[PDB]
Curated annotation (Swiss-Prot), chain A:
Oligomer and partners: Component of the 19S proteasome regulatory particle complex. The 26S proteasome consists of a 20S core particle (CP) and two 19S regulatory subunits (RP). The regulatory particle is made of a lid composed of 9 subunits, a base containing 6 ATPases including PSMC3 and few additional components. Interacts with PAAF1.
Compartments where located: Cytoplasm; Nucleus
Protein name per UniProt: 26S proteasome regulatory subunit 6A
Portion of the full sequence shown: 52 to 176 of 439
Protein species of origin: Homo sapiens
Protein family membership: Belongs to the AAA ATPase family.
Posttranslational modification: Sumoylated by UBE2I in response to MEKK1-mediated stimuli.
UniProtKB/Swiss-Prot annotation, chain B:
Functional description taken from the UniProt entry: Component of the 26S proteasome, a multiprotein complex involved in the ATP-dependent degradation of ubiquitinated proteins. This complex plays a key role in the maintenance of protein homeostasis by removing misfolded or damaged proteins, which could impair cellular functions, and by removing proteins whose functions are no longer required. Therefore, the proteasome participates in numerous cellular processes, including cell cycle progression, apoptosis, or DNA damage repair.
Assembly mode: Component of the 19S proteasome regulatory particle complex. The 26S proteasome consists of a 20S core particle (CP) and two 19S regulatory subunits (RP). The regulatory particle is made of a lid composed of 9 subunits including PSMD4, a base containing 6 ATPases and few additional components. Within the complex, PSMD4 interacts with subunit PSMD7 through their respective MPN domain. Interacts with TXNL1.
Tissues showing expression: Widely expressed. Highest levels in heart and skeletal muscle.
Residues noted as binding Zn(2+) in the record, renumbered to the chain: 91, 93
Family named by the database record: Belongs to the peptidase M67A family. PSMD14 subfamily.
Encoding gene per record: PSMD14
Name of the protein: 26S proteasome non-ATPase regulatory subunit 14
Whole sequence portion shown: 23 to 122 of 310
Disulfide bonds: none
Amino acid sequence: IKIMKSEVLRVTHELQAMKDKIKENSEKIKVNKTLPYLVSNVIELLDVKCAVIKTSTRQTYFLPVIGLVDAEKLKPGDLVGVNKDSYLILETLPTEYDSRVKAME
Amino acid sequence: PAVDTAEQVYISSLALLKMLKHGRAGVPMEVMGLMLGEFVDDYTVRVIDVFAMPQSGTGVSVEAVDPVFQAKMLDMLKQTGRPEMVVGWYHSHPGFGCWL
């Protein structure tokens, strides 16, 4: 009968504290994700979790960390929007086809 | 009235070390922080301590000065023994020299 009061109170308190702390962390991540998103490709994926990114500016940078996405859901050749200057992957991008390729159909 | 060319901003060694550390950590991007000190008189402003503002997507702007973070940092530093006021702000300028 003690588990009712003790556990319900403690667990709801941790739920609320973790919930508003998650909202704070997500807000910080969202505001930190500056939209420009310099488009880049992952030329290879290697273990230390680390990636070698060739940006659309024709220069390849090694990334000590993957970034804000999951390394498992990545492979060579995927389009990722990295930071303009930090060059860190901010989100993955869907398969993009050039206008010439679409006109080719 | 007007200000004079003899105005001297005093940067303590700790403040300069912290600013250089934050600048060298920030690169290639630009970081910012609020300067803590005192406007002791009209011909000089003295800064004693400086604290780093967490990096934001806005960059170095008015929106980069997080209100809640600044309030909390000032409140916690006042307890420690640094009840200084914000005399200004600093931001790193990688590559290009010191201008605005």
